[PDB]
Amino acid sequence: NAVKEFLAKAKEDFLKKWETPSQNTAQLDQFDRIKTLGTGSFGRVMLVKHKESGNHYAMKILDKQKVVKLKQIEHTLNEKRILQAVNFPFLVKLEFSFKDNSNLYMVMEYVAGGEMFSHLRRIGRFSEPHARFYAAQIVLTFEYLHSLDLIYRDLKPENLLIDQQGYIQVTDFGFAKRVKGRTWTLCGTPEYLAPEIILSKGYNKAVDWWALGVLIYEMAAGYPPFFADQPIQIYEKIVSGKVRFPSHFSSDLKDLLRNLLQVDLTKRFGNLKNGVNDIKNHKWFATTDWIAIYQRKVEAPFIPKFKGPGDTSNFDDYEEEEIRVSINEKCGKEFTEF
């Protein structure tokens, strides 16, 4: 009941910012660029430092020409519109955004602990309690997003960052979409694709609960439930309706995962009459204090080593290219709304 009123409030806030988006709240020459943290097909994310405040931020840079050239104009306008509109303890905060002649820029709080992917691969697999601590934050986060009619559609350890308190910050709304009923776009990463996406059916927010099942499996095994050397072979396993579990998995974990990795949508946890409460009240989450997780009062199982402001030791090294800004504005028409 306290949940329904919190989410009613959250919907109002989201909708005001959605309707009247933040635009052009800084400029490139207010920041020093320090290091590339990540890359994508139309740009990069860089650690930057605000010259006046000395605060560090993660700055996502998108090349407008490459965005138009790869026909993802809507996808990027949309990514920024959602990010500027949401507010949740496990979502990375957008602080500033702007554009120039060549690029779009989204300046986020810097999450210094790096990607869950790194920690998970280094240690091999997480204990059930450790995996459960992270899983609860994703459950609350999808509860939040779904209540705004958002589907996230790109869950992966690679895009779940670990903050200085060892909690999750979800990054990258690149594939997120406001959807009232069904949508049809084929997007994600092969190992996280829900079967209804693979089969080109119209799908809903339940693809996110399937993806949660893949994440929990992968966090607890150290590898995902469906993998092969060719995507089509992964897709065959996903749609097959069969999953194998490591014998070290608890019986409660196997049960939860059989219910999330349900090919049949009439049977998938998160998609039934009781919604997210089927997941929250599952035995695997018996020991979980949902309010305490939301209030970030639970002690993290792990805190990344943090060697001072702007430490990037938890991040991989990428080639440092020049950020060329043209003397002439490009694609100005297409990105008016940004």
Partner: peptide
């Protein structure tokens, strides 16, 4: 043998 390399997300 699972390939543990970081994964690319794509649309269409």
């Amino acid at each position: 043998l699972y390939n543990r390399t970081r994964r690319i997300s794509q649309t269409s």
